Amino acid sequence: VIVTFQEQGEQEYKNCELDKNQRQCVEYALKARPLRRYIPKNQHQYKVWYVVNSTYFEYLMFVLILLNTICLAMQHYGQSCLFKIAMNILNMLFTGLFTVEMILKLIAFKPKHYFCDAWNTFDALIVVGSIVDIAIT
Ligand SMILES: CC(C)CCC[C@@H](C)[C@H]1CC[C@H]2[C@@H]3CC=C4C[C@@H](O)CC[C@]4(C)[C@H]3CC[C@]12C
Numbered sequence: 001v002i003v004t005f006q007e008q009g010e011q012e013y014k015n016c017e018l019d020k021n022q023r024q025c026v027e028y029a030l031k032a033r034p035l036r037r038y039i040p041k042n043q044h045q046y047k048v049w050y051v052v053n054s055t056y057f058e059y060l061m062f063v064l065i066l067l068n069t070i071c072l073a074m075q076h077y078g079q080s081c082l083f084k085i086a087m088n089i090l091n092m093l094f095t096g097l098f099t100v101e102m103i104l105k106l107i108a109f110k111p112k113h114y115f116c117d118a119w120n121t122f123d124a125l126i127v128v129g130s131i132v133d134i135a136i137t
């Protein structure tokens with residue numbers, strides 16, 4: 001560790017400037033490019049865009065399926081048919097809810113710029129995997 005201290009502090013031991021934090025801030029924060037916007041106006045049919053803060057509720061949804069994914073603990077070396085079919089129904093309805101939510105949040109959200117956010121791509125991957133799971137059964 002001491003070696004790491006003597007192989008790092010000597011790069012700028014003599015600052016000859018304002019301060020290490022100050023010089024880094026003043027030489028890195030000046031290259032700032034503000035963004036104009038990411039929302040088309042189109043308010044005749046784009047009411048979805050202003051609908052925010054609902055995900056904070058649906059975030060709870062993201063944990064509910066998690067509980068379902070532990071319900072198979074009831075399948076410990078043995079299963080009850082009604083419980084298993086109820087779990088299948090819960091999985092199907094959760095996948096349908098995720099699919100409809102992503103469709104409604106991407107139908108009028110500029111699909112040209114939709115691929116910019118990798119989280120949307122991950123959501124597309126998980127929903128298509130769920131669709132494959134439903135179809136194969
Ligand atoms: C005869 C054998 C198969 C036992 C039958 C009953 C088993 C399958 C049931 C009875 C009580 C159940 C547990 C009750 C509570 C919890 C806590 C939860 O956070 C995870 C699942 C877990 C750990 C359950 C797993 C399934 C369970 C152990």
Ligand SMILES: CC(C)CCC[C@@H](C)[C@H]1CC[C@H]2[C@@H]3CC=C4C[C@@H](O)CC[C@]4(C)[C@H]3CC[C@]12C
Nearest residue numbers: 067071074079080081082083084085086087090
């Ligand atoms: C054949 C006999 C032994 C019945 C075995 C299956 C029983 C124990 C299972 C099958 C479906 C299960 C229910 C499925 C869903 C829920 C909703 C959850 O929020 C609370 C538990 C509750 C209400 C479960 C209780 C246990 C249950 C009724």
